[PDB]
RNA sequence: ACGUACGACCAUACCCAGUGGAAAGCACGGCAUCCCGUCCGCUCUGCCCUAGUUAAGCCACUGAGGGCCCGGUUAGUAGUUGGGUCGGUGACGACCAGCGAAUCCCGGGUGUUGUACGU
């Protein structure tokens, strides 16, 4: 049947903004994420933990809980973009890219006994779509 | 059970490579049973190794901090080829 | 130089070969020169030249006539040997090589170079008969060294080894005071010698005694009429020295500089001399073929997450140009519309038929070279943006009126249309339903990968590959499934390419064609029925004859199993 | 990083130990693979292996051997091959300045061959060089012949790393190669590996006892390509 | 998404590299270093950390490949008094001390040919990262304090500054007797209540505290130096391994034999070829 | 027999797709004070084996699966030595020796094994 150890989980939420303009945008990512962003032409920061779902919830609050079908990738990750950062809280356009993992991802990234994750445990597109419909009560069209 | 063996030809030992050329002809029984061939070959090898470490222990040793008694070896005298020749 | 006996026992006696051989063996130079014309006329005829080779005339010429101190007997011997070379095939050239004609040919080249290069008599004050005999000698040297270069690969290497003959070619093409036939033969022999030869290109670009590369570059840059015959030689130099867009040599050594003058040659062609146009089209097709390994040698000398973030974020845009590949810029901007204009000429002349055939060949080469580049998921975007409206122009101007109307011409336009449809990917202008014309061509059609039906299957797969009017995709899918059910009367290459096109068309489930065409027509049942029959026929293919077809059919079977499992899972 | 590699690749006055190379032919019986496995186990520190089944013949053309020796810095090669004419062959090649100096062929008898795994004692530790004893009349010949060449390459195989000081806690293993006297049939060379267990029945010196492990090989020497005197005179010299 | 296009020229790696358990480059570097250029074998001390356990053998390299001299595990420390946290630094030092005592007891430190030599070793860390403060150096410190001689520096010990070469021996002596766990328990007890109960459950129910942990580890070390050959039984020791052999055989999914393979081929012919 | 650690042969062990795994061990997992390292406790390092879960890793089995391997064969052939004898103006072909492949085909296989500690 189903296991509690195969439930979906947000892994990360990378935020990316594309001389002086990068310097100004680095402070915006620093005040939004709370961490120091890194350069590449473009700046980006990686956000994990319980604040990542808060940032993604605010980003879905910008797009009023509606996302297109073409945005959900076939790997399982999904992303979108907002052209103005003012309504989150010079106009800056930034995109939100989010990755989905189950428990047991560490078997692909550890040093000792690195292995491939199984075929029945890999995340698919339709499960991500069902998760999106279930949690935030958003409609995919 | 003696600790030395006397053969008609003297051994030609070369301690630089831990070597002992033996010019005394080995008498192969040439029998169908391989077992007696194995004990004859092992006896010849036993005599060779006995002469080898007897000539090794004849050479002076020195105890060391590494805690291993070391046997000083002469430089190698057997001619051998070379990987790459002498520069300049 | 063994004195073997001559067993003359032919049914037809040598009534005239014996006096010709006696006159050739005579010590008189004028008699030998007079008999050279008769011997050449006899050698031009068939069924009697073999009797002259039974006389061992070639050894008598080689060790006695060509070794004579008088230059006239040497000229007659070289005329005899060049006539015998022109009449007979390359095994004669191998026979000359095994008698060491290369040492004598280099000695004669050095002697004639010493007589022509000297300014002490000088060469200019000589009589017209003497200089005419000298130029006839050099013509014999050039035609013989060209045929020996065309004989075999090791003979080509041995000719490229000798420096004196290359110096003679450099002095001949740099002095340019010879008559036009000798200069043209020197150009042709440098063309044949420069193909895939590092040594010839190095000697061309490294000469400072005459600076031959400077003269060739100056000629190729200008509007000199014969200069286009030189240009491909430089192209062969740029084929040999790896002087291309990724790493140019002296003065930005790329083929793009060679482009416009040849294009200017295309400006010299008018609707309603032809060797110049044919050589220009051959050189352009050569550039178009060589641009493929130019690309792979350019490429020879995390990211997936970034590509997914770019694709999913809907941030796709078009910018930039082909600044890193200027040869492609000069080909697309100038050469492609000129070949389009040249292809659509009136067909009132057979010369125009040959010109149109070579133009379609050049367009086929450049279109296949461009279309083999991967444009999936927006990679190499600027090249696609440059090529796309010109590719639609090629489809509108060339493919449709030719297809409105020869098996060879149909094969060429099918290959060109496949090359265009591989990069258009369903954005082809559907005017007058060209896929129905392709279906009619394939039905009228009735080593294995170059058939007409294979290219017809390939083009009708690509036209509906991506979103395009559902009815075109419906007709293509019905045709492909009808081909797959009746697999008894088709070659396996057609089956392999039809399966590959069926994988590429109906792959993902996001498209409307998967819901509207694939599941409504029940193609999965036909594929599941087809799987054991295609397993039997791919077990029927021998491996030692066509290993490529066997490997591609095994790949087709594995991908068919994966595809039917995918469509069973995704419903 | 490549500076130390170039320094190791450079010729040096005091020679480093030679890196052997084991490579396999197109056809190879299981006996020849087991023999190369045993020899590679006994030369485990200074060796390299190729699992790519290279299609070369060492006696006809030696260009591929020169290419492999310049690419991998290998001055000693063991090539295993199998034919209907010659059932199990191991050819030993010594090369000098990336050109072939000496080659020899050993024909192995498959009926009397025993691997290391079939003896069940304590084995030799990795990298400890064994003592050598060469008992036989055939090794002492005035003219340079086959058995002197076999001695001159089995010494180079089993020498390992030279040292002028050797602790007594080694010296526990002997490699015994023996050749019959040159009499019809060609003489048979024999390679045995033995371990030394000391029993002190004598008052002063210990008495050896011999226990067998390792390969049990019966070679017959075959084809040969002797070195040229020009390479021999210049590579036999001493610094 | 499709077109698996292939690869008979693809050559696999070794068995213990596809599983990712051994790096053969570091293994070759370790066995070459150990030779000493004298022809003397050197024993290398391996240490591997699982979750819940510490595995410490002391291996030597052979042709068949390896011979365990003496193996010390973290399980039998439950026989010496310590029962909670058998993975931390203090258990690592205890396992190193137990391993050194075991290898020095079974060495004895009838016709030997050597005609009081302390023991020698080489540290093996495996695929574990060799950062400072890592418990591989705890096992190494336990071995080097137990009586064997390991060539080592104080660079990788914890409580060691990096911009000056001073080792705070108070911090090291705190980690030997598990003082970091003690002060962590004190901090979690004072400034928290949920985590100090969520963790340290077996510490709570067995009624141990900071100074009790320190004296208990000291008594454990004295017990290790007293009699290092105890035995432990934990859960369910059904002995007489033939019983375990029968139990494993009657839960093993057996294969199909050659007659059964012929029967399966006949069934496949009747089901697919003959439908 | 099964499990771990360390290994030896290094695809019979890999690749894809299905079904199952008692005991213990492996894992997954929990936490971020200290040692330590990051854009991010993701990896690395430290603390807890309590709560969970065999979903994946791992192991086992299945598949007219792809691949791979062993034995017999294809061959002392092709090819090569233009190395030697006869033809052939030649190109080259017969002939005699030495060296000497591979697919196809037929039969079988899908891991053996060492030390230590356990269930």
Residue numbers in the entry:
A (entry chain B): 6 to 23, 28 to 49, 66 to 114, 122 to 173
B (entry chain D): 11 to 98
C (entry chain F): 20 to 291, 301 to 329, 388 to 491, 495 to 535, 550 to 674
D (entry chain C): 11 to 193, 220 to 275
E (entry chain A): 2 to 7, 13 to 115, 133 to 138, 142 to 301
Per the authors:
The 5S ribonucleoprotein (RNP) is assembled from its three components (5S rRNA, Rpl5/uL18 and Rpl11/uL5) before being incorporated into the pre-60S subunit. The 5S rRNA is separately transcribed by RNA polymerase III and, after joining with its cognate ribosomal proteins uL18 and uL5 (previously called Rpl5 and Rpl11, respectively), forms the minimal trimeric 5S RNP core complex, which is eventually incorporated into the pre-60S particle. However, when ribosome synthesis is disturbed, a free 5S RNP can enter the MDM2–p53 pathway to regulate cell cycle and apoptotic signaling. Here we reconstitute and determine the cryo-electron microscopy structure of the conserved hexameric 5S RNP with fungal or human factors.
